[PDB]
Amino acid sequence: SLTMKSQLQITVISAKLKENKWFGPSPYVEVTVDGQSKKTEKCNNTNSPKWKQPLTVIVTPVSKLHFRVWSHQTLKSDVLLGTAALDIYETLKSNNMKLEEVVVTLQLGGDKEPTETIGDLSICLDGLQLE
Ligand SMILES: [Cl-]
């Protein structure tokens, strides 16, 4: 029951990234959960990326979703801009135990400094219920 899986759709909607003082980042989002990793495509040179991109992951009612916002680079590692996490069980609680097009915004915490908010990330969850 807490072990039954669902192929959850997560639409990664958009993010607002605090400006860094010339050209902006070229961000995409990676979702990781339960052995899996799914990445959106990138937006180029923007602190207000709008992906509106649906991804799926196979989760249980107690899975914990982890988000990373990366900036793409050709010639070295992509840069980790910030991270967030969302407990699917808490999300279910907040929405009568059924995730039907639930929009959630999360604060993104900095890589080098976890305590610093570097932006926020909006997603929409659909296709999971408990009971
Ligand atoms: Cl949470």
Swiss-Prot record:
In which tissues does this protein get expressed? Widely expressed.
Q: Which domain of life is it from?
A: Eukaryota
Specify the C2 domain's residue ranges.
Answer: 1-101
- Which compartment or compartments is the protein found in? Cell membrane; Cytoplasm; Nucleus; Early endosome membrane
What does the record say about PTM? On T-cell activation, phosphorylation by the JNK cascade on serine and threonine residues surrounding the PRR domain accelerates the ubiquitination and degradation of JUN and JUNB. The increased ITCH catalytic activity due to phosphorylation by JNK1 may occur due to a conformational change disrupting the interaction between the PRR/WW motifs domain and the HECT domain and, thus exposing the HECT domain. Phosphorylation by FYN reduces interaction with JUNB and negatively controls JUN ubiquitination and degradation.
Q: Which residues form a coiled coil?
A: none
What disorder is listed for this protein? Autoimmune disease, multisystem, with facial dysmorphism: A disorder characterized by organomegaly, failure to thrive, developmental delay, dysmorphic features and autoimmune inflammatory cell infiltration of the lungs, liver and gut.
User: What does the protein in this record do?
Assistant: Acts as an Acts as an E3 ubiquitin-protein ligase which accepts ubiquitin from an E2 ubiquitin-conjugating enzyme in the form of a thioester and then directly transfers the ubiquitin to targeted substrates. Catalyzes 'Lys-29'-, 'Lys-48'- and 'Lys-63'-linked ubiquitin conjugation. Involved in the control of inflammatory signaling pathways. Essential component of a ubiquitin-editing protein complex, comprising also TNFAIP3, TAX1BP1 and RNF11, that ensures the transient nature of inflammatory signaling pathways. Promotes the association of the complex after TNF stimulation.
**How does the entry describe the domains?**
The WW domains mediate interaction with PPxY motif-containing proteins. The WW domain 4 mediates interaction with ENTREP1.
Summarize subunit and interaction data from the UniProt record for this chain. Answer: Monomer. Part of a ternary complex composed of SMAD3, ITCH/AIP4 and NEDD9/HEF1; within the complex NEDD9/HEF1 interacts (via N-terminus) with ITCH/AIP4 (via WW domains); the complex mediates ubiquitination and proteasomal degradation of NEDD9/HEF1. Interacts (via WW domains) with OCNL. Interacts (via WW domains) with NOTCH1. Interacts (via WW domains) with JUN. Interacts with JUNB; the interaction promotes ITCH-mediated ubiquitination and degradation of JUNB. (Microbial infection) Interacts with Epstein-Barr virus LMP2A.
How is this protein named in the record? E3 ubiquitin-protein ligase Itchy homolog
The species this protein belongs to is Homo sapiens (Human)
Of the parent protein, the shown chain spans 13 to 145 of 903
